[PDB]
Design an enzyme around this catalytic site. Sequence first.
Site, PDB file in Angstrom:
ATOM      1  N   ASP A 103       3.322 -18.556  15.748  1.00  0.00           N
ATOM      2  CA  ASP A 103       3.014 -18.496  14.316  1.00  0.00           C
ATOM      3  C   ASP A 103       4.215 -17.948  13.546  1.00  0.00           C
ATOM      4  O   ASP A 103       4.420 -16.732  13.501  1.00  0.00           O
ATOM      5  CB  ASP A 103       1.792 -17.610  14.084  1.00  0.00           C
ATOM      6  CG  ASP A 103       1.417 -17.498  12.614  1.00  0.00           C
ATOM      7  OD1 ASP A 103       1.962 -18.278  11.791  1.00  0.00           O
ATOM      8  OD2 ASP A 103       0.577 -16.624  12.295  1.00  0.00           O
ATOM      9  N   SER A 156      12.368 -26.022  -1.388  1.00  0.00           N
ATOM     10  CA  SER A 156      12.512 -27.466  -1.336  1.00  0.00           C
ATOM     11  C   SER A 156      13.022 -27.993  -2.675  1.00  0.00           C
ATOM     12  O   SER A 156      12.737 -27.437  -3.733  1.00  0.00           O
ATOM     13  CB  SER A 156      11.151 -28.096  -0.998  1.00  0.00           C
ATOM     14  OG  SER A 156      11.186 -29.507  -1.085  1.00  0.00           O
TER      15      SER A 156
END
Length: 330
Positions: free
Chosen positions: A35, A199
């Site tokens: 994770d 992004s």
Amino acid sequence: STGSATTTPIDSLDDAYITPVQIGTPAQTLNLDFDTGSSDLWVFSSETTASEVDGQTIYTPSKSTTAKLLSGATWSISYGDGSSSSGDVYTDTVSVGGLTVTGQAVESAKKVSSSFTEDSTIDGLLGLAFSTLNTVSPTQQKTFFDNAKASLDSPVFTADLGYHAPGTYNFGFIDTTAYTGSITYTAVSTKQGFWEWTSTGYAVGSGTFKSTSIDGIADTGTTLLYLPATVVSAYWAQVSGAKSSSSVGGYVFPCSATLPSFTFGVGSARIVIPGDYIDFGPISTGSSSCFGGIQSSAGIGINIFGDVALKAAFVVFNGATTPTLGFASK
């Protein structure tokens, strides 16, 4: 040193991925959920409330000659999906894919929430975010990656998750046979303890690319792709019959649909998520309403590049002194 381990979807939807981890002496092998959105290595154990164990493999520290109680240490964690666990702490030898760390904090669960009990395939979590998020008190502990880093050939790990198929986590090296083209690297902020990046935009299907900054986290421990409501609305508007359902808890769409792809920007590069990756199947057994793999982050407080996005790429988690993320197509 290096390590290399195969990671395998837990079910036919790729709801999560499990990777075998050796703990203790002699080894006890548990299948953990790696994770990158958390920083605790915790396991079902001989100390877990018996009614909260239902098919998981447990770590029994009393059978490990290298286990030592970390005196006074406790842990307690709550995840974004509302699940939680807590317990006490041992140190022991932990190996992943041939890479061994001695003295790793292994957090032994005394309690787990119902969703953990109900998932017999996940024996615990191995956190790979930054150690500043580790919940051990009163002495915070380091992640497996942080402990291994100095010994690794290169201070990196990579995530290569499969679509309906096994993949690989590598530690200490970049497998240049595992991706196509070049790796595009992008800056990371560690200020929230996550692999947080920006992004450069998105496209829906064959549509034009929209340049817009989207701050979010690379999180192997989250199944879906969570993005701002404007972006998610633009995606689902291209699917006839798709709608946001408050009763279901997100966007659903007719199971008869063919989904468009979704592209996200990494600098000047582009990662394409095929439409099939966004199909999470019937909302309930036999239903013709299917659950979408792109959902709004509006209620989370952070955008999450979860498995839906990451499994479309070869992803480099670069833990150099200034961390960065790298993305390649594959």
